[model samples]
Target: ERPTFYRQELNKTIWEVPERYQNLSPVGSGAYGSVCAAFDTKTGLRVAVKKLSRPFQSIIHAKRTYRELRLLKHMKHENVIGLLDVFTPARSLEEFNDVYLVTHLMGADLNNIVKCQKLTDDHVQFLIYQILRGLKYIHSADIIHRDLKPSNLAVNEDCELKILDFGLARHTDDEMTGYVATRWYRAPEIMLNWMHYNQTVDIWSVGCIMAELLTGRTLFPGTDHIDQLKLILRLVGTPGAELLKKISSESARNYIQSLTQMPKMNFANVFIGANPLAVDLLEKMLVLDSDKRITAAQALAHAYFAQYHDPDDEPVADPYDQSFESRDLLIDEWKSLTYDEVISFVPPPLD
Candidate 1:
């Protein structure tokens, strides 16, 4: 193989990529890390190179990076972004501090598309179809994306969509959660501190995203957690005492009990001009109780996707083995494990 790796310091971060990739330029940055758009000369394809920020800064950070790397590599589906390559510039485990992730470059995220482009029903249908399809795969693997907002949904010119960035997958850092954008997509159970939640949480997020796509506006735009629940109840209606009892937080239960009962808004009236079938599916997805929410698999079979629905085409993944996540390991141990994962990544077909 060509030289093991190439080193570039751009935007105050060091990127270590294989020799096959070139023409790197910064495209995005976030609290956890940054990404650059680059051209892979070997495959003649453009790609995204993401660098995990300060992964070894703490055991928690290191574990998150390793988890993200492993999960991206394992998930392979048309509607889910796949990992093409992973590498680091460090020659030895002691110096292995950085990890770079590579995937196909996407033109824009749903957030940009929603703001800059007017989407037709067909566009919305196909986008949601792909999202549920992708979610089916993720849930099949027994993983919850946790965060499923428009920005995490990437699309190309042909309307081909791929789910990217597992938001809830990260170690919950208060600094990151402080951002308001993600709150709109969070399920009611998560915010209220209900004892536990499962994959259904993602379905609620899909509902929020679907509603946004249909109306060109966020379905629930809450300035804070309390405001968020109020906005949700305003549309979905306050859960009855039966559902309220399930919440473990007494204060949260008290707050909901005190709110005036809001009659659920009829979807047809709420989305005046949207298709009946789309509204029907949206209703099932936005159910107040996690237990009552329509799952990704069931949503795929909904009449709204009648024309595009194909049972055989909507694939599922084997449950991901998460045994390693619990293992107690030192930074050196985590570093070596991460290095092993990077060295073992095999790039897809070159041509």
Candidate 2:
């Protein structure tokens, strides 16, 4: 039976979504778009509909769309959000303006979980472990999920976690953009406007998220960017002259020197009742210098996850059939590429 379609107003247009996807309600909204929870009447499953706000607004927007589409198509892993369905309201290229992505409906994001729900020690370790699992696959592909704050990580009651939101993601080697990750989770080198960074920047974010999970609060809640640096310097404190020498920004270096000295806090004191091993792991991940930050694989092997670690419990990976390099893309090329990959797109086999 073909269900009748009625237009319901979306952000800027009348949204007459497929009748099969019923019971729509706004769940999340951001600068670019909004997310809605709906029931797939045909499949009898719940799904999340993420509609892009404006994909073709600028060259960066188009590039982000292309990069996300490519990564979402190729980066198949259990710990990462799976691209379920793709559709647009427009029938032709001229009408085709919005992009909608269908993914498994997540019960809650890690942000709410950390702030609203209390977790046992084991749950904390498991959550962080899953984050690492996703990163292991993402970093292996030579890409970095530049924005990895708690809101970007979805979760369910069963302790299952999934990483999402690739708009800010890019190759680690990309030098054009310095600003990445949320203010709370941004790395120091990035805060200092470093010339180049690598996967270690993500390791720093994992540490911040892990800390928030343990303590139920943001570790570095800076009012603004400079304040963020102040809060981080308070905990990580100032680095040595040698580390400062490698800083890419002189202004950032001078700012740190001008500030009053801050002492690193005792982890046990901050995250009370936290496992000592967990604290140790946090220290390694939250290093001020990117070079010293622990890699995701190394963090997985740490004693923190020792009790629950399983070699078998790894990210299900898919081979990269497409070559994805960090480069400028032609914005006009986006017109021919329809994001609708429902039938032909096949995810790689899980290892």
Candidate 3:
């Protein structure tokens, strides 16, 4: 029997969401909006509701949302999170509003999981491989997931990963505008304020995620934008003088000039005792020139993952006894609710 709250219409206008959805308990909050876990009275399904505070005032906002929906619709990969639906508030001249996007609610993100216990080398390697696979899929579609970090990588109850939050994502063929992505995961070309960048930016972010997974901390934890740049330079070494010329921003150029005298970074000491493969991948992804950065597909084929694969080229599964059956139920519950109802559900405990 359909639950009492079931609405036959697949798409509900923003205004039509019942008050129950508004009662959802928040799971996490960010710059754009909050995510909540909610139960659908009709379907009895638990779901994650990501609600944006307001519509974008500019073309970029529209573009990002459009890209997210378009990419999610076209890209069908197991590693990447699947989008169930999106609910944008109907356009109205007389009132302000927000939009909601709904998807299967995976369990804890990598950051949360890391807090409970350090990941085994194999686990980290698998995580990185999954990330690269997702990235490869994203790039194959000509879409770039500009924001890639541990927080955006979710692990279901079964330990399967799903990449989330495409708000910062954009099409590679489109014009670049606005410096997007979290500071720690930002690429050097982005730090230099280059007007144009490519999919390599996502690769750099992936490298940062790999390092964080191995070290249990941020690779470059900048206090601010300037500090972030300094931390990046200190670890990756400052960009070359000729490379500085390529940056169009006068302020960014001047900033680079001031840091020319700083000592070169020693990656070994920076991540003392970390796995060599982690460091090796970091170096390749965080290169000063965007052109030289390693591609996600290339990273997957690196020695790191290759070491664990069989002669037939199949990735080895972890020997651990962990199973994802429970996790699959959690996701199923999350996908059964309307977008609005998810925002009203209780959030899971934080790790």
The residue pairs in collision within model 2 are none
lDDT of 1 by residue, 163-270 (tens): 988863475546324337868788988866764888899999998988888888888888777788888988899888778888888887787778889888888999
- True-structure Cα RMSD, model 1: 2.1
Best prediction by lDDT: 1
If the candidates were sorted by their lDDT against the true structure, best first, what order would they fall in?
1, 2, 3
lDDT scores in order: 0.85, 0.74, 0.62
Candidate with more favorable, higher TM-score: 1 or 2: 1
Question: How big is the positional error of residue 179 in model 1, measured in Å on the Cα after superposition?
Answer: 9.1
Among these predictions, the greatest TM-score belongs to 1
Candidate 3 residue lDDT tens string, 77-125: 6677765545434333223244566566667888877766456788888
lDDT of 2 by residue, 144-252 (tens): 7777889889988888889987645333344323243356787878755754778788899899999888888778887667777777887888767877788768876
Q: After superposition, how far is residue 252 of candidate 3 from its true place, in Å?
A: 2.2
Runs off by more than 4 Å, candidate 3: 1-46, 49-65, 85-101, 168-181, 262-264, 307-351
Misplaced by over 4 Å in model 1 are 116-118, 168-179
Q: What is the C-alpha RMSD of each candidate to the true structure, in Å?
A: 2.1, 4.7, 11.1
Which of 2 and 3 is ahead in lDDT? 2
User: What is the alpha-carbon lDDT of model 1 when measured against the actual structure?
Assistant: 0.85
Q: For residue 29, give model 2's deviation from the true position in Å.
A: 4.1
